[PDB]
Design a binder for this molecule. Structure first.
Ligand SMILES: Cc1ccccc1NC(=O)N[C@H](CC(C)C)C(=O)NO
Ligand SMILES: [Mg+2]
Ligand SMILES: [Mg+2]
Ligand SMILES: [Mg+2]
Ligand SMILES: [Zn+2]
Length: 890
């Protein structure tokens, strides 16, 4: 396979200054005429001029109006257009091509494609080359003049990046519109849309310069009623970037557009952000609660890219984390501000420590700045995004807000209108660090190891208290396991936010402080510590690491009850659960492997259970927080701690723990489920798509979590509650009713009731699919076949395929059926999907990432299906690279 290496970056021998496009859409073809105003750079050595261009049908090629001919002046192999150097001019020249493409048959959803009745593009990362010829790499920055033409009745709204400078009629019922985007950009930010779209709009006035900006949000007509919250979220995002970062929008208009068929969440094309409809559209009668947070985060994310990605872009794709890590960090700061709920930060931590930690202990492990790739599209990973965001957040922790803002402004201004690298960011942050330390010899050179070193550090602690001296020490060690990327791992710069809690009264003993660990080990000593404390470590999850607190369960309970920091309280609970899970898992495993007739199980700590009850009964404690403490850690977190994991033993472990706790708490759970109803399900704001009460949402989450627990338990007469819950106006509630009814004979009645409620809204039907797929049913395989035959059928919509299959792959007992039948079903889907959408097929591989963590029979089953997939003729490069890497062949 063809391998790109970070070290081999070199600037191009060519420059593309202007791009003038005419995109003429017809029913059975799209013609793209393109003039590139080009020149030779200072790096040119008289090389052949080689353009990327994939799957293009050439009508004509010329340079300075001289037609070039195949075999004589150029070659084209359906991937690269090579213009022989004799025919490449030595100063400014005009390159002209006209090609034919077919959006109507583009089911890969990259390049120019049709999504229902909308024509849309997706160019990041390598899609622009499927539209026209280009030197398709992000350092080739140019200005764009785009004309779109189409049939007027079918495609009345025509959009491209930037200012609409003309609109015109064309004979034969056609029309055109011309766009000028004044801002230099890489081709990955080009976009066009053509459709019968409806809109909402508003005018936004910028905070500092008072620029009037016209904000438009677009969808198909059926769903125009679902646009308002996105528009509100865009206004919020703009105000946030003004308020925190001092950054104003830079065009007279910003359009956001929803499309039904989209490979991921959304895309930041300049002035023309394009979204999966599931990440832009909601209404309170037709969407679950989680849609609202999802739209907030995705609108925010694309908006924040306007500076971190667009106004400052990437030198090369190895720098991906510089825009994605940084933008996710911005998106998270925004989300935390807008929701004002502690569960927001906790959700980010949960995502990292489950999926990203698994990735980082897998054969796919990479640093946030990879050293090589075959398909760049396989490095849009939770590592690059979520670990990257934690790396970007650690700068804020280290510097504090004021000096963080100073550093960020150095970066964004210095590199405006240009490309940048991860080093440029580190350099800006290092200038701020020098200022903060008031020491021009302070440096962040060690910090760069967070970009280059793969794997998750493990940080462990030992404590000592000297009562006579009132002096406390925290001894800290860090270790990162060697891997395929580095045989020797170096210590990182790890910021450890800490507090100290007095166990006798629950109060804070020090001003919070941030320990700067830079060696493999260090001892931090505190004076004037009046009694032996319990330490509150890694507050806010201050570095992306495995934490070994070396606390007793009694100490963890005291932090859970009394500490101030939500992450520490949550992590203390997580740790109590993990100790229990690992102990019961080992008990069950030994019993199974030794074929014992009788054995013991370690009970769940009774004082921990008492602590859960105390928290749940505190009417002044946070409902979202409560929902985190009654839930065991996710399976993808637990697996990071077990080698040769037997999934059936784990399922039995989790069931035992849950049942131990419910046997004590179910009456508490029931009382709370009823008491919370009035506030949870109050209809304030039910008609207001500009305002969400995230606290009330967390109350519904808690009710729905409790209802699940009580349903699994078969708590007496709970079916009555489930049936009432199905009548609630909130989709979060009535879909919960279907999930929790899995444990009762009423499940198929609720399956039909909820289907009827869901079937007339595309996105609600997809949420219904997910609810069915995740249902804890012994007959889940027969239900999946029913979904395939009755609902999914031949759909090529990635949201339908993902909705049917992904939730089911998280069913620990059933997906990992020891027959292998789960692995086989998903591998058949992956292979089917790969023949038309390789990016989605690779997404569907997710469950296999943990293969080498399983017991050896399951490892063998998964490996056999991965190798079967690899044998498939015409396997995509995306899938083949992914699977070769995952199975330790690449
Ligand atoms: C792909 C992915 C990987 C990891 C985490 C989140 C995403 N989702 C996107 O929507 N990503 C888009 C990618 C774009 C190339 C379509 C993104 O970052 N939008 O700004
Ligand atoms: Mg083609
Ligand atoms: Mg996000
Ligand atoms: Mg559809
Ligand atoms: Zn992004």
């Amino acid at each position: 396979p063809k391998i790109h290496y970070r070290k081999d970056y070199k600037p191009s021998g060519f420059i593309i200054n202007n791009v003038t496009l005419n995109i003429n859409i017809h029913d059975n073809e799209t013609i793209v005429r393109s003039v590139l105003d080009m020149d030779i750079s200072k790096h040119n050595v008289g090389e052949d001029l080689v353009f990327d261009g994939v799957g293009l049908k050439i009508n004509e090629i010329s340079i300075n109006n001289k037609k070039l001919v195949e075999g004589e002046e150029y070659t084209y192999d359906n991937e690269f257009l090579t213009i022989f150097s004799k025919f490449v001019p030595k100063s400014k020249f005009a390159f002209s091509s006209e090609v034919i493409i077919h959006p109507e048959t583009n089911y890969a959803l990259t390049g120019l494609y049709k999504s229902k009745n909308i024509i849309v593009s997706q160019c990041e990362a390598t899609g622009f080359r499927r539209i026209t010829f280009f030197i398709d790499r992000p350092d080739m920055m140019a200005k764009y003049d785009v004309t779109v033409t189409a049939d007027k009745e079918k495609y009345p709204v025509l959009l491209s990046n930037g200012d609409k400078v003309n609109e015109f009629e064309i004979p034969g019922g056609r029309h055109g519109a011309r766009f000028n985007d004044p801002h230099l950009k890489p081709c990955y930010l080009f976009a066009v849309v053509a459709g019968d779209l409806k809109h909402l709009s508003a005018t936004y006035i910028t905070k500092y310069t008072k620029k009037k900006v016209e904000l438009y949000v677009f969808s198909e007509e059926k769903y125009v009623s679902k646009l308002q919250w996105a528009l509100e979220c865009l206004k919020k995002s703009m105000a946030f970037d003004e308020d925190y970062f001092g950054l104003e929008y830079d065009l007279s208009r910003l359009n956001l557009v929803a499309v039904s068929d989209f490979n991921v969440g959304a895309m930041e094309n300049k002035g023309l952000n394009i979204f999966n409809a599931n990440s832009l559209l909601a209404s309170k009668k037709n969407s679950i609660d989680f849609s609202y947070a999802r739209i907030l985060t995705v609108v925010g994310h694309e908006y924040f890219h306007n500076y971190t990605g667009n106004r400052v872009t990437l030198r090369d794709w190895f720098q991906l984390t510089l825009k994605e890590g940084l933008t996710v960090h911005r998106e998270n700061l925004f989300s935390e501000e807008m929701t004002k709920t502690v569960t927001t930060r906790l959700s980010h931590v949960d995502l990292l420590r489950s999926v990203q930690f698994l990735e980082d202990s897998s054969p796919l492990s990479h640093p946030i700045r990879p050293e090589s790739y075959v398909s760049m599209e396989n490095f849009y990973t939770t590592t690059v995004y979520d670990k990257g965001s934690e790396v970007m957040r650690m700068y804020l922790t280290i510097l504090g807000e004021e000096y963080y803002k100073k550093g960020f402004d150095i970066y964004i201004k210095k590199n405006d209108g240009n490309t940048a690298t991860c080093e440029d960011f580190n350099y800006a942050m290092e200038q701020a660090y020098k200022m903060k330390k008031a020491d021009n010899s302070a440096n962040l050179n060690q910090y760069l190891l967070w970009f280059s070193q793969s794997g998750t550090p493990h940080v462990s602690f030992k404590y000592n208290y000297d009562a006579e001296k009132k002096q406390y020490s925290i001894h800290v060690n860090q270790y990162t396991k060697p891997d395929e990327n580095q045989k020797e791992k170096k210590p990182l710069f790890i910021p450890i936010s800490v507090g100290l809690i007095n166990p006798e009264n629950g109060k804070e003993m020090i001003s919070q402080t941030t320990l700067e660990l830079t060696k493999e080990s260090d001892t931090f000593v505190f004076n004037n510590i009046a009694v032996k404390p319990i330490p509150s470590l890694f507050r806010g999850f201050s570095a992306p690491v495995y934490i070994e607190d070396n606390l007793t369960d009694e100490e963890r309970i005291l932090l859970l009850k009394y500490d101030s920091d939500a992450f520490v309280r949550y992590n203390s609970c997580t740790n109590i659960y993990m100790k229990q899970i690992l102990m019961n898992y080992n008990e069950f495993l030994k019993a199974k492997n030794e074929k014992l007739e009788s054995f013991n199980l370690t009970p769940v700590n009774a004082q921990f259970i008492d602590a859960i009850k105390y928290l749940l009964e505190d009417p002044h404690a946070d409902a979202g927080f409560k929902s985190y403490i009654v839930s065991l850690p996710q399976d993808r977190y637990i697996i990071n701690f077990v080698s040769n994991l037997d999934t059936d033993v784990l399922a039995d472990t989790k069931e035992y723990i849950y049942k131990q706790i419910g046997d004590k708490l179910n009456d508490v759970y029931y009382k709370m489920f009823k008491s919370l109803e009035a506030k949870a399900d109050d209809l304030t704001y039910f008609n207001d798509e500009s305002h969400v009460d995230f606290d009330q949402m967390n109350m519904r989450t808690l009710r729905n979590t409790l209802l699940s627990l009580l349903s699994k338990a078969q708590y007496p007469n709970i079916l009555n509650e489930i049936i009432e819950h199905s009548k609630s106006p909130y989709p979060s509630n009535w879909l919960t009713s279907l999930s929790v009814s899995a444990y009762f004979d009423k499940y198929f009645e609720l399956y039909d009731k909820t289907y009827k409620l869901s079937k007339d809204d595309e996105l609600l039907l997809q949420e219904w699919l997910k609810t069915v797929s995740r249902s804890d049913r012994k007959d889940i395989y027969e239900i999946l076949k029913k979904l395939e035959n009755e609902v999914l059928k031949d759909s090529k919509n990635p949201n339908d395929i993902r909705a049917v299959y992904l939730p089911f792959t998280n069913n620990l007992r059933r997906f990992h059926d020891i027959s292998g039948k789960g692995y086989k079903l998903i591998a058949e889907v992956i292979t089917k999907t790969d023949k038309f959408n390789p990016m989605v097929a690779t997404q569907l591989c997710e469950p296999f990432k943990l293969w080498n963590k399983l017991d050896t029979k399951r490892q063998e089953l998964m490996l056999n299906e991965m190798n079967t997939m690899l044998q498939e003729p015409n396997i995509s490069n995306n899938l083949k690279e992914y699977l070769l890497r995952l199975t330790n062949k690449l």
